[PDB]
Design a binder for this molecule. Sequence first.
Ligand SMILES: O=C(Nc1ccc2ncccc2c1)c1ccccc1
Ligand SMILES: O=C(Nc1ccc2ncccc2c1)c1ccccc1
Ligand SMILES: O=C(Nc1ccc2ncccc2c1)c1ccccc1
Ligand SMILES: O=C(Nc1ccc2ncccc2c1)c1ccccc1
Ligand SMILES: O=C(Nc1ccc2ncccc2c1)c1ccccc1
Ligand SMILES: O=C(Nc1ccc2ncccc2c1)c1ccccc1
Ligand SMILES: [Zn+2]
Ligand SMILES: [Zn+2]
Ligand SMILES: [Zn+2]
Ligand SMILES: [Zn+2]
Lengths: 360, 360
Amino acid sequence: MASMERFLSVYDEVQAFLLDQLQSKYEIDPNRARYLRIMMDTTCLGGKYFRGMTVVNVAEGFLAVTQHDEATKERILHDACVGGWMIEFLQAHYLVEDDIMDGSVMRRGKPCWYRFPGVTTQCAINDGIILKSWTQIMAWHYFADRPFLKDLLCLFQKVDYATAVGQMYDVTSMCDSNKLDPEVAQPMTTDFAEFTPAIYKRIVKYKTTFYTYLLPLVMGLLVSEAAASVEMNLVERVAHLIGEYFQVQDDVMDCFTPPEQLGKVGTDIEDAKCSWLAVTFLGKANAAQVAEFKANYGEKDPAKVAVVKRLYSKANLQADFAAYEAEVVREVESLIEQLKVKSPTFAESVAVVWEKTHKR
Amino acid sequence: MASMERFLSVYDEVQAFLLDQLQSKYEIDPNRARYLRIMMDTTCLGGKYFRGMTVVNVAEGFLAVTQHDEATKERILHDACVGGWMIEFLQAHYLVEDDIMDGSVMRRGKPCWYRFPGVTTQCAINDGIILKSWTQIMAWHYFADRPFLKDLLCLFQKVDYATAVGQMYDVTSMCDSNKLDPEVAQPMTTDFAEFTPAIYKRIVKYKTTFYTYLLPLVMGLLVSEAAASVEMNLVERVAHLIGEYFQVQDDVMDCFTPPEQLGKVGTDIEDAKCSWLAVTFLGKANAAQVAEFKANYGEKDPAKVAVVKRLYSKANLQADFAAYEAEVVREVESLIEQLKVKSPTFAESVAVVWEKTHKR
Ligand SMILES: O=C(Nc1ccc2ncccc2c1)c1ccccc1
Ligand SMILES: O=C(Nc1ccc2ncccc2c1)c1ccccc1
Ligand SMILES: O=C(Nc1ccc2ncccc2c1)c1ccccc1
Ligand SMILES: O=C(Nc1ccc2ncccc2c1)c1ccccc1
Ligand SMILES: O=C(Nc1ccc2ncccc2c1)c1ccccc1
Ligand SMILES: O=C(Nc1ccc2ncccc2c1)c1ccccc1
Ligand SMILES: [Zn+2]
Ligand SMILES: [Zn+2]
Ligand SMILES: [Zn+2]
Ligand SMILES: [Zn+2]
């Protein structure tokens, strides 16, 4: 955790850079500077730093096998940290805005940012916008002269857009596609015909995998000037696979993990989310159980939510999860083997990403 | 309006490009594609296209005095149009999100996008995010090989951030700065001590001037490969000046222009906005009128709103507006004269921007 230390120190630097700039070029006053400092901390700190630290880890692995001056080593580690915080702030953006979109109450055992008394939705929507603009201000400042600037900005931009499209797939996942119409209020599906594996996979791929796995791995390659070292179709396939697994864990926990341990009260049932539980349950239920699911899903009534949870328990979805978990393990190993050929170093970083995902 | 024709045709092209890409690379289905096509149209079309057309006009003026192959002329005009739509979509982003932030009802005589029955705030916040990501997707696609790419992206990014910071200054403009605290619900100011010219100028500079005037003028220079033709401090000063004037018109109309002609019911009074009317009124009112303003401002009660409007009328703010209007005219002329030296062509484009602002 020398690595973590360096990561968290660069946070303080980037924060001081951003706030200093607000004063020198944006005419900000101290009280507004303090409000943003607080906003930044509250929204960007307190997680595990998985996405940002992956950039750092990928760069550290290349540093162990690549010849450089010390000053160059330090520059590469600094860039990996700044790149990691670009991802963290991008995540922060999306969590602030998603929490508002969904009317969420808590995140990480603390209230959602919009719910803070002196924030409100009015300021919070803009605060999220600020979060994401800070990523660009970081990039243009710290990476102005870097040969990877263009590639890094273009990647970032595509990942951002993927994530927004994924959010659209998510927010629309309980509607019937043939009924989407801005002019007409959308009913919740009655047939659940679109609660399929292929459809779930589409949501998760765009909404999470791009920003959580693809971006930190490819950013670590880009700040290392190492991208031609790997087969980018392979990196993409392994990110999309690990990414899917990660969300299937999150889906299971939303239902079954105690709220104090989850950091929030899960509401995927009431929200009629296209979860791995729902999709899996529908792939194996009999006619009477499908009917009972339809009568009870997507409803705030706790009585009906508890009917859903009992259908899940009875249907033995733990056996489906274990089968899934074993197959993802096969596939992740296969892809690591394919990466080992070209870059053993990069394959080991992917192995570590997978280990941290698989046993969290 | 050959110019306008070309501008609006490039819209259809860019829309087809974006939706086609969503299908080929983002696994979108037709119904979701149609929802976004509708979103794009509703949020991006129906204004005057002032900001986008300024990019086109600035480029057309350089085309009239610069030697190029026909194919090059067409490429420059195409780039100016695509750049203009980047600004329009950036505007669309901000209007969707601001309308949600403020709980607005109507914009341009039609409901705010979030209020459409099949949209809702949940989808609308993300739709706005999409709007702004489309600007980047346009830029990277159409300008991939362009020597101005870097300069254009860096400018865009700084203007975006300026606009977000300006939105923060705006949303916080009725709070006492020394009281801003995310932990504490914010009371409306009781002293109106921060309703000053310098403070109003700070809001308007960041919130509007950057994206409405600076960005279209400098973008037109950048797609023309003409930026070293001008003194950029001068371009900045004239944009900030015209920009301020534009917002002072908007402030006056919010109060006095009939709602059917305004396209919305103005609520700056009820919202306790730091308007040019409020600031000007406070710069000339006597003690009894300041007290009466304080008793009635920032309150939805129509009785109290009509007390505010009568204090404004009695205080003869039309004389202040005319003095202001005459002084901005002096200053805008001065700056045009300074620009005429280096670029007469660019000075004429600024003249046209000012004429369209001054007599709207
Ligand atoms: O906590 C640790 N470092 C920091 C450093 C800078 C911070 N700045 C702001 C907020 C939190 C920070 C935390 C740490 C790192 C490695 C091993 C043990 C501890
Ligand atoms: O930590 C690092 N740089 C800095 C620099 C100036 C700071 N000022 C205030 C607060 C924190 C600061 C951190 C660093 C350096 C090289 C490689 C990786 C990290
Ligand atoms: O990939 C998924 N299921 C699979 C695929 C292949 C398997 N092969 C062997 C054993 C179990 C398997 C499970 C899946 C299903 C629903 C939603 C998301 C993902
Ligand atoms: O209205 C005009 N042009 C267009 C062109 C393409 C459009 N595509 C989508 C939506 C609206 C469009 C409008 C026009 C332009 C110049 C002189 C007169 C008329
Ligand atoms: O209008 C222009 N291009 C296009 C190209 C393909 C289109 N496809 C569908 C719809 C509209 C299209 C417009 C254009 C060309 C040069 C200079 C400026 C503008
Ligand atoms: O610039 C502003 N007022 C000025 C400045 C100088 C003038 N010189 C002569 C006559 C009228 C003048 C008016 C202003 C005031 C409040 C809010 C925003 C702007
Ligand atoms: Zn959500
Ligand atoms: Zn979840
Ligand atoms: Zn607003
Ligand atoms: Zn207004």
